[PDB]
Design a protein around this ligand. Structure first.
Ligand code: PC1
Ligand code: PC1
Ligand code: PC1
Ligand code: 3PE
Ligand code: 3PE
Ligand code: 3PE
Ligand code: 3PE
Ligand code: 3PE
Ligand code: 3PE
Ligand code: DCQ
Lengths: 98, 70, 110, 169, 114, 96, 105, 42, 347, 314, 80
């Protein structure tokens, strides 16, 4: 198949490995998650436009809307834990080990 | 009195008249004395490319009419 | 083709102006200044109001993205369905605004 | 090299993804994500999706990454080896993949990809007096009644949920 | 699998309607009115056979009929049609509403001549 | 005023569309003849080139059926210069 | 569980999008309408187990329309042989493949 | 079964409530004239 | 929390589950999943303490990762098939990605690390809602795509889930963590029997739902969240001690109780396909679940732990909690074995 | 040849910005019973040149910026987005004819707030950051009503193309059927470019307090270019002119006069009223402008259906 | 019911205007006699080709030429 498909898959894999290995902050995890969504957007849009599937052109808009609502919920959770601890570090979310 | 703001407004009006006039004159000059053809949809672009291919000069604004048919 | 040429021209003109605006008084040798906000070292206070208005803007922006294809969609043959769906979407916008209004969501930044 | 414009843009896209995925700082990650989103919108525009690319600019960048950077400015108070290491190794795998693609004009990692320019897959016909993607999006109010209903209900419920959980009571 | 069959280069040879887009647009309504039968036969063959190699001869007949249409235009109404397609060709979007007067002149000329 | 002018604009649009409908059979015939000529020329040059390789059939379809399939853009312009490729594939998108 | 509420109630909630060969606005065809129609007219009513083996050639044709790996490979081989013959100097390109053809219409 | 790793593991609270672990102060200088010290709560 | 807002949010959770169940489009499956998760987040954060926000954060991150993997599988399937009908998949990579996404959503091992912490951090009612209702939609999606599921992957996930759940539940003293590890083991059983006869999977899902609902309802009726606070129940209401004894015996699969029927029919199905080592291993591993159930019954019903002085003050007042459907699910989770051939209604 | 068109677009923008500074000073002076600059040149015609040279030989502040990257990048983005929002403007022929030029403009305007965000974050002052956050919140909150108003106005046009907007107003001005939208659009564009009575950063720290005099001048020039662009866009939307296809100079002169009058109305507004508070303008937007914008949006969706006046798609 | 409208129109006139405009927008298209004109104007716009039908012998309604009397008419659109 095509080449830009390979580049978008590799971009998605890079963002997934970024999400799956936290460094210090929760915001970097959210950024990696939203980059994953952006790669999904580009891949689906290219496939739908190249395939001339007319009625599938509405799908990336719904995908963008739902994942941005997801991101709003995640930002609210990040703000709540930052108000609790004074920072958004992932090492402070360890009370539930016990 | 109040008519002394008029030189500045006149300079501003000249500087706002310049880009539109330049754009219209450039479009008319570069397209053989006609407007720049609008191609918003693929049918209009297909007509553009057909006219370019039928011109014989590889130039879409050289339009040939009844002088070409036998 | 012409569009990205214009974009490159605007970008390089802006970066040329910014470079001349930065580095031209750098050629002056004026002086060396020591210089030893009303708050000295206070932490930025986290305000829920600014975050709340940001998230409300984001959600209304999403429903705006939903509302955007109305000029194209008005050309459909199924006009009753399109009118009903458009009115339902803007009614949901109004209902979300009213729920934010009644539960003191728009409070102290009204 | 001008026939490879979408391929070059995809290379810039994945390079920006490597850059922001190394997590140097949340604000620099946001800047890299903004640049990557702009390049991806360029990819979509060069493929023919004007409306979807302008949705990416209007909603993802102008409407949502603003909220991300706005929240980033309200935390992560202003003033590494790992970041540089992963950036370098990601650039290395990326350029190795590019060299292996362009040297043999075929590659297999998980699926089989072809190294020719991506202008080959395009359609040779015209769409008439309309654009196909605009009609497909515009069919949302005529065909996608159920999609409109579930999306609007989810958006309203999201407003209610965000108002519920940030109150603290 | 199989070997795709293509017509020879002599079978694709025909003399063309070598007129521009605005020349076609100026006489589009009269071309649709006068040369309708071979055009509709070609379109029916095209939508039925789903194969241009089975509609090559119908397309050839379409070219012949269009060429005779323009020859008949040239015999009697060359000058009003020339003015009409000129003022059509000036417009950027090629509007029909910017050239009503020359359109009426061309229609009257071709009504009393043909 | 908007109602009257928009009704007139709708009538003008209908007139323009029906002019295009009257025109386009000729364009369809010309497009079919042009793409058939392109395919024939590419097949002849493939016959000239693809000769040294053993087990190569000139003009072998990739599909299992004999139904006509619309040619790819790379099937037509794949043997031509890069300027025509740029003008055909990205020509409409890049046009202003 | 897959509760077929739509078939029980007669509503059409997502069947319009579910395939590419369905009813599209303004009668716009897709690139692989015919192949998908043939594959669906195969697989209808015989189950997945029989349709995975009985007329698989329709699905191979549909997949070849969708992704076009064989056409890309054939073009790659033709262009590679052309490049080798051009470099070794026993092939001259024709005038119509170098931009000197003055195309038909 | 407590181990060496599970030695700092406290039990959860009885009501499952952990403790939550001021306001802004601004010094508007003299930059008539007047200095102001403002204790602001948003 | 407002009663009306709570009602709307709960109907939104059920609406998301219904949208997943009834739809024939992959995008609608995805939409139902996000609607369900977005609506269920405020149920977890009903009490507003740091533990609930931590549990909500971990749940959100896990579900978002699983959802992105699901969308990736859907897009790959569209690329290799050109359609969106919810049926068998046309790519092994799409099948693997979707199977691991559904495993992450179900919380099966080795993606199990979020289940006990999330269950511990949230109240008993929200934990019941999670561990009972949240698992109806991924099992339905798995029920729709079984021709494309890799057998080795799903069987590895099943045996890993059973062993890890038993070994994890051996060490816990909090009741919610015990319930979480029990859930992990039961989903291991359910997806073990999935590829041979999914009707057995439906029967096991129904029985596990009823037993978990009974145990959680008894827990909120007595307001106990630890082992010792549950051990105080003998001096307050001994009928509840009898009920938790019989329900915990039935949860261990001991005949002739109704919990014996799912593993009995699962072993019956697995031996028809000449798989004998795996059902024996799963039974021997389920002995560990029986072990910590029996430890709970020792601490609660079969011995009398010492009580305190204020139990008299608690004696002087009756209970007023709405123990909804508690006798019905108490009866249905213990004396349903003579009605075993009723499983033919699920085919 | 095209670069000549680009240059003759972008250089008169800077010239018009400098003379807009001069015109605003003189008009405010004559409106406050005094004179503007008339000593530096004949009626102050040499004032922008002297002011520009003075600002470009001024000592830089040299701040202790947290990030020199976005400190550089914020004026880059401000100037690029100020200059790039002129290319689909029909004058009467746009330089870049766009099928979706209106939504392209909306995307650029939504993207314009990153300059404020990065300028606030780059400066080490926390009060500067707070002022930047407040300005960003006001800007996005007025983006919302900009989008709804533009969407509701476009239902009389039929497409997103800016050149069709001339064709729509060939009969009558669009301010006749949509004057409440015109008033709300004018106030929303006034609050969009951070102008009085909404310029809160000048009332009691700006987002660019630590920026040097040169980059401050670049930011201010970008803001004035935004003002001129918005007024030209408003003139195209609501006050469309008569366009002769054989004489484009008629349309050029007509819309130039109208847009200059609208910009003079901006300066007239800025010297008549006191400033709003932050909560007062938030109240004016979320509780006054938004419900009426939604009601008028529903009205202008449902109106062309009931009048049999759907504009043509193409 | 009557003094409530006067009080709410004296106090919040913006909300009164918004709700009145909304009610007009939601009840007027179901009441106007021009909605059917919008319907048959939208459905009479020729986007794609009118593909001809093969003449079996029994189609008196289908014309054999555009200028034939039988067929759909847009005289109602020309007059309105
Ligand atoms: C077009 C928009 C505006 C563009 C910029 C303005 C246009 C004019 C540009 C040239 C102006 C003159 C040079 C820059 C200003 C120098 C002012 C200054 O402080 O000079 C003293 C300075 C230093 O003189 P100094 O050696 O006496 O130092 C005094 C300072 N102490 C003693 C503390 C060290 O002069 C310079 O830096 C010389 C700069 C270049 C001089 C001109 C070269 C040719 C330019 C054509
Ligand atoms: C609250 C929901 C209010 C609107 C309900 C739908 C109104 C409507 O126009 O229905 C006809 C429309 C469209 O009917 P139609 O007859 O215009 O469609 C003809 C068929 N197509 C789409 C191909 C043109 O919807 C349906 O008929 C089915 C979809 C909606 C079914 C009801 C969902 C209710 C969900 C409640 C939760
Ligand atoms: C582009 C063309 C020119 C535009 C105008 C330019 C010149 C005028 C400039 C004016 C001054 C600008 C500077 C100040 C800006 C800030 C103040 C401001 O604008 O506040 C807005 C004010 C703010 O309102 P407010 O704050 O006074 O409201 C009071 C609210 N409470 C009580 C809660 C405090 O008004 C509006 O928002 C109204 C917007 C326009 C409404 C248009 C309604 C049209 C008629 C509808 C129908 C009515 C009849 C009833 C129904 C009939 C149904 C059939
Ligand atoms: C094998 C599985 C992983 C495959 C990708 C590996 C990328 C290179 C990583 C090398 C190891 C770097 C490391 O230690 O990362 C840990 C870090 C989180 O740890 P932190 O808190 O930042 O610091 C403690 C460091 N021990 O975590 C990170 O910094 C995560 C950064 C991931 C960046 C991935 C970039 C793309 C890699 C190629 C494509 C895949
Ligand atoms: C193939 C299968 C397809 C699907 C088939 C059907 C599946 C049905 C699945 C049922 C899932 C039940 C989920 C959990 C209960 C949902 C209702 C709810 O929200 O209950 C919690 C609620 C919280 O209220 P609150 O007052 O805060 O409680 C704290 C204690 N004071 O209220 C309370 O806490 C009140 C106290 C009593 C709660 C009792 C709830 C019992 C629910 C389970 C009934 C039995 C299972 C369903 C029937 C059999 C299905 C197989
Ligand atoms: C699109 C249109 C944009 C237009 C922008 C500009 C608008 C304003 C135009 C200029 C208006 C008049 C300015 C007059 C300046 C003063 C001229 C003068 O006489 O200066 C005299 C001064 C001292 O002379 P001195 O020899 O010492 O005198 C002793 C003799 N008794 O000698 C000196 O100071 C030295 C010589 C100074 C000469 C200055 C000349 C004017 C400079 C204008 C710059 C911009 C020009 C336009 C650029 C854009 C268009 C090309
Ligand atoms: C190699 C040789 C060249 C070397 C480099 C020099 C280039 C040319 C620089 C400008 C000309 C040099 C002389 C400058 C002025 C000197 C004479 C002077 O002082 O004239 C004073 C006179 C006004 O007198 P004043 O003292 O103000 O009295 C008030 C009324 N009672 O003032 C006036 O009448 C007006 C003076 C105007 C000065 C010229 C116009 C401004 C500069 C234009 C060019 C530079 C800027 C171009 C645009 C940049 C972008 C804005
Ligand atoms: C910190 C980094 C630097 C920051 C400053 C610089 C970047 C930000 C400021 C500039 C923003 C530029 C935005 C460019 C995209 C805008 C959308 C667009 O191109 O629309 C025009 C047009 C679509 O309209 P339409 O009429 O349908 O097309 C012709 C159809 N016959 O589409 C076309 O005509 C398509 C033409 C071909 C494709 C062009 C692709 C452009 C290059 C990619 C994006 C460049 C910007 C990347 C960075 C973003 C911001 C970080
Ligand atoms: C059914 C029609 C279509 C409906 C859907 C479309 C709606 C479009 C408009 C959307 C508006 C969204 C926001 C609405 C908020 C209303 C609630 C509200 O604000 O109540 C509070 C307010 C009193 O104000 P206060 O409590 O002091 O708040 C601070 C501001 N002063 O309370 C008030 O001022 C009283 C508000 C309620 C009474 C309004 C009555 C208006 C009647 C107009 C004539 C009838 C119109 C026909 C429709 C029936 C209306 C009942
Ligand atoms: C290419 C560079 C052109 C020159 C720069 C822009 C024009 C100069 C603006 C100077 C200026 C003037 C005149 C001015 O009057 C003013 O006060 C409102 C400013 O802000 C404090 C200014 O920045």
């Amino acid at each position: 198949m095509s080449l830009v498909y390979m580049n978008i898959m590799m971009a998605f894999t890079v963002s997934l490995t970024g999400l799956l290995m936290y460094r210090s902050h929760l915001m970097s995890s959210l950024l990696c998650l939203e980059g994953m969504m952006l790669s999904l957007f580009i891949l689906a849009t290219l496939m739908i436009l190249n395939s001339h599937f007319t009625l599938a052109s509405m799908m990336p808009i719904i995908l963008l809307v739902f994942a941005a609502c997801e991101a709003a919920l995640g930002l609210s959770l990040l703000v709540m834990v930052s108000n609790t601890y004074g920072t958004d570090y992932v090492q402070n979310l360890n009370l539930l080990q016990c | 009195m109040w008519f002394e703001v008029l030189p500045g407004i006149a300079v501003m009006g000249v500087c706002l008249f310049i880009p539109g006039m330049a754009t219209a004159r450039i479009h008319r000059f570069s397209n053989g004395g006609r407007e720049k053809r609008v191609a918003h949809y693929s049918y209009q672009w297909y007509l553009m490319e057909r006219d370019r291919r039928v011109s014989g000069v590889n130039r879409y604004y050289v339009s040939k009419g009844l002088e070409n048919i036998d | 083709m012409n569009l990205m040429i214009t974009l490159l021209t605007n970008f390089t003109l802006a970066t040329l102006l910014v470079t001349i605006a930065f580095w031209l008084p750098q050629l002056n040798v004026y002086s060396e200044k020591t210089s030893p906000d009303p708050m000295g070292s206070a932490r930025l206070p986290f305000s829920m109001k600014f975050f709340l208005v940001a998230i409300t803007f984001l959600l209304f922006d999403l429903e705006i993205a939903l509302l955007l294809p109305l000029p194209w969609a008005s050309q459909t043959t199924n006009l009753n369905t399109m009118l009903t769906m458009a009115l339902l979407l803007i009614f949901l916008l109004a209902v979300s605004l009213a729920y934010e209004w009644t539960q003191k969501g728009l409070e102290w930044t009204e | 090299m001008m026939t490879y414009i979408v391929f070059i843009l995809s290379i810039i896209f994945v390079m920006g993804f490597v850059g922001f995925s190394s997590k140097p700082s949340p604000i620099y990650g946001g800047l890299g994500l903004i640049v990557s989103g702009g390049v991806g919108c360029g990819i979509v525009l060069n493929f023919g999706g004007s409306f979807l690319g302008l949705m990416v600019f209007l909603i993802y960048l102008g409407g949502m990454m603003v909220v991300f950077g706005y929240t980033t400015a309200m935390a992560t108070e202003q003033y590494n080896k790992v970041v540089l290491g992963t950036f370098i190794t990601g650039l290395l795998m990326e350029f190795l993949m590019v060299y292996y693609v362009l040297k043999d004009k075929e590659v297999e990692i998980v699926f089989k990809f072809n190294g020719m320019g991506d202008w080959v897959i395009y359609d040779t016909g015209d769409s008439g007096f309309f654009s196909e993607e605009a009609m497909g999006i515009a069919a949302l109010y005529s065909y996608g009644t159920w999609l409109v209903i579930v999306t609007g209900w989810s958006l309203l419920i999201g407003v209610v949920v965000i108002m519920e959980i940030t109150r603290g009571n | 699998p199989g070997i795709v069959e293509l017509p020879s280069l002599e079978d694709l040879k025909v003399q063309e309607v070598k007129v521009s887009s605005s020349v076609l647009k100026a006489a589009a309504h009269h071309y649709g009115a006068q040369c309708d039968k071979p055009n509709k036969e070609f379109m029916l063959c095209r939508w039925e056979e789903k194969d241009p190699r089975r509609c090559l001869e119908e397309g050839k007949l379409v070219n012949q009929c269009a060429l005779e249409f323009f020859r008949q235009i040239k015999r009697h109404c060359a000058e009003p049609f020339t003015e009409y397609w000129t003022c059509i060709d000036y417009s950027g979007l090629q509007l029909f509403r910017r050239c009503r007067k020359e359109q009426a002149q061309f229609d009257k000329c071709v009504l009393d001549k043909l | 005023s908007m109602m009257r002018w928009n009704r007139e604009r709708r009538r003008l649009q209908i007139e323009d569309f029906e002019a295009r409908i009257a025109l386009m059979p000729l364009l369809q015939a010309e497009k079919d003849r042009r793409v058939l000529q392109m395919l024939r020329e590419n097949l002849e040059e493939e016959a000239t080139i693809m000769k040294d390789v053993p087990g190569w059939k000139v003009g072998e379809s990739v599909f299992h059926t004999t139904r006509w399939v619309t040619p790819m853009m790379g099937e037509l312009y794949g043997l031509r210069t890069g300027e025509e490729i740029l003008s055909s594939t990205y020509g409409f998108i890049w046009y202003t | 569980p897959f509760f077929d509420v739509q078939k029980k109630l007669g509503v059409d909630l997502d069947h319009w999008m579910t395939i590419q060969s369905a009813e599209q606005p303004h009668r716009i065809p897709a690139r692989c309408h015919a192949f998908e129609k043939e594959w669906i007219e195969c697989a209808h009513g015989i189950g997945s187990i029989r349709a995975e083996k009985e007329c698989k050639i329709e699905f191979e044709d549909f997949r070849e329309c969708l992704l076009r790996q064989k056409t890309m490979k054939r073009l790659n081989a033709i262009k590679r042989q052309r490049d080798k013959l051009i470099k070794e100097g026993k092939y001259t390109p024709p005038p119509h493949h170098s931009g000197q053809e003055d195309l038909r219409p | 079964y407590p181990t060496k790793e599970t030695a700092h593991w406290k039990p959860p609270p009885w009501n499952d409530v952990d403790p939550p672990k001021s306001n802004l102060t601004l010094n508007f200088g003299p930059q008539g004239v007047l200095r102001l010290v403002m204790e602001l709560s948003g | 929390m407002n009663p009306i807002i709570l009602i709307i949010i709960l109907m939104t959770v059920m609406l998301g589950t219904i949208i997943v169940m009834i739809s024939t489009h992959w995008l609608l499956i995805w939409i139902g999943f996000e609607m369900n998760m977005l609506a269920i987040i405020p149920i977890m954060m009903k009490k507003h303490n740091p533990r609930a926000t931590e549990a909500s954060t971990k749940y959100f991150l896990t579900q978002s990762t699983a959802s992105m993997l699901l969308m990736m599988a859907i897009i790959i399937n569209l690329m290799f098939s050109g359609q969106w009908t919810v049926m068998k998949l046309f790519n092994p990579m799409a099948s693997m990605l979707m199977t691991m996404a559904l495993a992450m959503k179900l919380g099966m091992a080795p993606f199990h690390f979020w289940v006990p912490e999330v269950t511990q951090g949230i109240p008993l009612s929200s934990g019941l809602i999670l561990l009972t209702w949240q698992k109806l939609a991924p099992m339905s999606v798995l029920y729709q795509i079984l021709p494309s599921i890799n057998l080795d992957l799903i069987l590895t996930l099943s045996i890993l889930s059973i062993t890890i759940g038993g070994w994890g539940g051996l060490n816990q003293t909090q009741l919610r963590k015990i319930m979480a590890y029990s859930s992990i083991a039961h989903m291991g059983w359910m997806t073990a029997v999935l590829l041979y006869n999914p009707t057995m999977t439906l029967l096991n899902l129904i029985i596990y739902i009823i037993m978990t609902s009974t145990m959680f309802t008894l827990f909120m009726a007595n307001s106990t969240t630890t082992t010792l606070s549950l051990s105080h129940t003998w001096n307050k209401a001994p009928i509840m001690t009898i009920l938790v004894l019989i329900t915990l015996l039935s949860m261990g699969g001991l005949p002739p109780l109704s919990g014996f029927m799912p593993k009995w029919m699962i072993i019956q199905e697995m031996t028809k396909n000449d798989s004998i080592i795996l059902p024996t291993l799963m039974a021997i591993t389920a002995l560990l679940n029986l072990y910590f159930y029996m430890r709970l019954t020792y601490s609660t019903a079969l011995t009398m732990f010492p009580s305190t002085n204020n139990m008299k003050m608690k004696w002087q007042f009756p209970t007023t909690k709405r123990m909804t459907l508690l006798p019905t699910m108490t009866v249905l989770s213990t004396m349903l074995l003579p009605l075993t051939p009723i499983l033919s209604i699920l085919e | 040849m095209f670069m000549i068109n680009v240059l003759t677009l972008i250089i008169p923008i800077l010239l018009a910005v400098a003379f807009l500074t001069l015109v605003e000073r003189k008009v405010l002076g004559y409106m406050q019973f005094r004179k503007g600059p008339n000593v530096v040149g004949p009626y102050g015609l040499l004032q922008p040149i002297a002011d520009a040279i003075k600002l470009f030989i001024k000592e830089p502040l040299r701040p202790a910026t947290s990030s020199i990257s976005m400190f550089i990048l914020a004026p880059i983005l401000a100037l690029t987005l100020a200059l790039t929002m002129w290319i689909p403007l029909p004058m009467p022929y746009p330089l870049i004819n766009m099928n979706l030029g209106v939504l392209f403009m909306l995307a650029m305007s939504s993207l314009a707030v990153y300059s404020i965000l990065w300028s606030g974050w780059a400066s080490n002052s926390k009060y500067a950051l707070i002022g930047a956050l407040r300005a960003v919140a006001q800007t996005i909150s007025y983006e919302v009503t900009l989008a709804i108003i533009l969407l509701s106005v476009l239902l009389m046009n039929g497409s997103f193309t800016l050149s069709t907007l001339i064709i729509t107003q060939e009969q009558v001005w669009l301010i006749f059927p949509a004057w409440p939208l015109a008033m709300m659009w004018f106030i929303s564009t006034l609050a969009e470019t951070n102008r009085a009575p909404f310029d809160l950063t000048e009332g009691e720290s700006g987002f660019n307090v630590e920026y040097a005099a040169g980059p401050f001048a670049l930011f201010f020039m970008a803001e004035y270019a935004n003002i001129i662009m918005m007024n030209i866009f408003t003139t195209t939307l609501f006050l469309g002119a008569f366009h002769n296809p054989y004489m484009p100079e008629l349309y050029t002169i007509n819309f130039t006069i109208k847009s200059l009058l609208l910009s003079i109305t901006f300066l007239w507004i800025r010297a008549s009223y006191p400033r709003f508070r932050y909560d007062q303008l938030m109240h004016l937007l979320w509780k006054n402008f938004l419900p009426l914008t939604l009601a008028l949006c529903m009205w202008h969706v449902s109106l062309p259906i009931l009048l049999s006046s759907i504009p043509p798609q193409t | 019911v009557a003094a409530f409208l006067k009080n709410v129109w004296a106090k919040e006139p913006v909300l009164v205007a918004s709700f009145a405009i909304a009610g007009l927008a939601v009840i007027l298209p179901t009441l106007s006699p021009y909605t059917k004109y919008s319907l048959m104007i939208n459905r009479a716009t020729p986007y794609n080709y009118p593909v001809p039908l093969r003449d079996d012998g029994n189609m008196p309604d289908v014309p054999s030429h555009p200028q034939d009397p039988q067929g759909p008419s847009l005289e109602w659109l020309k007059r309105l």
